[PDB]
Amino acid sequence: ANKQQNFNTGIKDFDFWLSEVEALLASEDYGKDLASVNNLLKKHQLLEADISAHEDRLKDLNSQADSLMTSSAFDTSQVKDKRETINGRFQRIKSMAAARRAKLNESHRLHQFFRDMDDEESWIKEKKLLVSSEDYGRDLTGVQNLRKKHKRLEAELAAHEPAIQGVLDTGKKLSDDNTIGKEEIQQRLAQFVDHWKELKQLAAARGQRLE
Numbered sequence: 254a255n256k257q258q259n260f261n262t263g264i265k266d267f268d269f270w271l272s273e274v275e276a277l278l279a280s281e282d283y284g285k286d287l288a289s290v291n292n293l294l295k296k297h298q299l300l301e302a303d304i305s306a307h308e309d310r311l312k313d314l315n316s317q318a319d320s321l322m323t324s325s326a327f328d329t330s331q332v333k334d335k336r337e338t339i340n341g342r343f344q345r346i347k348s349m350a351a352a353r354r355a356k357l358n359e360s361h362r363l364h365q366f367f368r369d370m371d372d373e374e375s376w377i378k379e380k381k382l383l384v385s386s387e388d389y390g391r392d393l394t395g396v397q398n399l400r401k402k403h404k405r406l407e408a409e410l411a412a413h414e415p416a417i418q419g420v421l422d423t424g425k426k427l428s429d430d431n432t433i434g435k436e437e438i439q440q441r442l443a444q445f446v447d448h449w450k451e452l453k454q455l456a457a458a459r460g461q462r463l464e
């Protein structure tokens with residue numbers, strides 16, 4: 254083939270690839286959990302490696318376009334226009350790829366935060382089961398032994414409160430810096446506070462019943 258035909262073949266292939274990547278990068282799937290965000294991050298790494306491997310494909314197509322544009326044999330305006338368009342599309346793909354990377358990393362941080370919150374909610378739930386006891390002591394000796402167990406539990410809740418505040422502080426930062434949607438973090442933070450207040454209230458009600 255001549256240089257015109259080789260460029261046209263290369264451009265048909267490059268154009269198809271650009272269309273594929275444009276469609277892939279328009280996905281707003283940020284995942285539902287840490288395992289699915291991790292799969293999206295692996296997928297996105299491979300795509301970014303594919304884009305990187307095409308930046309040299311683009312250099313070659315650019316060199317072909319520049320050689321074609323020196324020709325006196327045909328009107329080179331279609332070559333010039335194609336070169337402009339493949340370059341503009343490629344640069345937009347690099348911008349979309351960086352934006353999707355930032356959102357996937359944000360999503361990973363958010364889902365890791367949710368896992369950290371789940372560990373705290375499991376702690377809360379274990380303690381809530383302890384203070385849900387409706388044994389208030391058969392006698393003076395029996396309530397004295399329950400009152401000493403309950404003061405130890407209240408001291409555990411007070412010593413854990415900095416960890417609960419740390420979850421709220423982290424959640425505020427993530428919410429304020431969020432670009433992918435705050436509906437889930439808002440709901441989870443509210444539900445988390447409800448879980449902590451419920452445990453504190455149930456512990457305080459039980460403590461009053463042991464006096």
Ligand SMILES: [K+]
Binds near residue numbers: 372373376
């Ligand atoms: K914990």
